[PDB]
């Protein structure tokens, strides 16, 4: 059904990462991300878009982690990656622009973003395009200088050299507060 | 904690799969597998061990998918929602009839943290080995390796590769764990008879 486009996508990503990761690794990234998201979103017609965005962001994080690439890298984890971590990631990138790279993930991803998140967000001028629930993966953790867990519990490998923060909390309000402080603090630690 | 242990396992696996897969692939295999399991099972002191087992099985599946393993036996995969009941039952019953004559795998769309305790107890009571089993998510490498892929209520989560037998064994509510084991056993018997004949 999507084999051909995934193959063509893999080919294009493999070219992009030519001297950095082999085609083999690239192939695996694309097919595994596809299946990984299918598990919670089901096979649908938008899936190859989501699989490619996920694989692409995961590869750049891996390249970051392996010193192959670089601004500060922040990761937000909640359970479903539909509400909380999505808001927190949207607000940070809103305030910080391209001075940070911000990602989010879930331990138990929902099939879609919560109806309200998009867009109480645009109603505050806040960009949230190409947002989807996605599973937590290792590469994005390795990449991160800062990891903010938000009710997921103990799902995250503790890598040395990172700042791990736990945030126990419509709810966009409180998050807003904490994201502004966070950014202030991140910006200041450079 | 586990990061350093995981590093040791990747080094060892790098060297074992040298000539076959890129070290970069091998290293992702172990850490991604760990993180995958951690999502549903949580960090516990034995997560590194289950991750190593899962990675090693996954790398073998990928070796097979790509014809890097000579004379493979038939490869069968069962898939249900939580990889705690249905697929674990089916997988253990087929290994129990077939032994070394097939490689059997299972997986879930939404793994539980552990096998259903009653599954463990009932299979145990009738002498079916089920001991190193654990719920794990569906991954692409094991689909590619598989000659038979059997679906048991997971929904449309599984890509449809050519060269394979796709079987669907769940076309309100459900029966007692007891009865599901019996229905599945009946189906596993026919599947095993059929597999034996078709080779």
Automatic annotation (TrEMBL), chain A:
EC number(s) reported in the record: 1.-.-.-
Top EC class, one word: oxidoreductase
Domain Phosphotyrosine protein phosphatase I, first and last residues per copy: 72-185
Classification via Gene3D superfamilies: 3.40.50.2300, Corynebacterium glutamicum thioredoxin-dependent arsenate reductase, N-terminal domain
InterPro entries recorded: Phosphatase-like_N (IPR048716), Ptyr_pPase (IPR023485), Ptyr_pPase_sf (IPR036196)
GO annotation terms (biological process): response to arsenic-containing substance
Keywords annotated in UniProt: Arsenical resistance, Oxidoreductase
Pfam families from the UniProt entry: LMWPc, Phosphatase-like_N
GO terms assigned for molecular function: oxidoreductase activity
Protein known as: Protein-tyrosine-phosphatase
């Amino acid at each position: 059904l999507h084999t051909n486009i995934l193959n063509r996508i893999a080919n294009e990503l493999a070219l992009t990462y030519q001297g950095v990761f082999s085609a083999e690794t690239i192939n695996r990234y694309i097919f595994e991300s596809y299946v990984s998201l299918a598990r919670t979103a089901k096979i649908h017609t938008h899936l190859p878009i989501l699989a490619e965005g996920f694989a692409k962001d995961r590869l750049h994080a891996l390249a970051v982690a392996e010193g192959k690439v670089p601004v500060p890298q922040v990761l937000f984890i909640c359970v479903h990656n539909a509400g909380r971590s999505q808001i927190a990631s949207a607000l940070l990138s809103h305030y910080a622009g391209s001075s940070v790279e911000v990602r989010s993930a879930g331990s138990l991803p929902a099939s879609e973003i919560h109806p309200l998140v998009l867009e109480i967000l645009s109603e505050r001028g806040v960009n949230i395009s190409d947002a989807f629930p996605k599973p937590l993966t290792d590469d994005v953790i390795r990449a991160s200088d800062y990891v903010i867990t938000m009710g997921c519990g103990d799902v995250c490998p503790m890598y040395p050299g990172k700042h791990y923060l736990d945030w126990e909390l419509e709810i966009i309000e409180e998050i807003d507060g904490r994201i502004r402080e966070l950014w202030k603090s991140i910006q200041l630690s450079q």
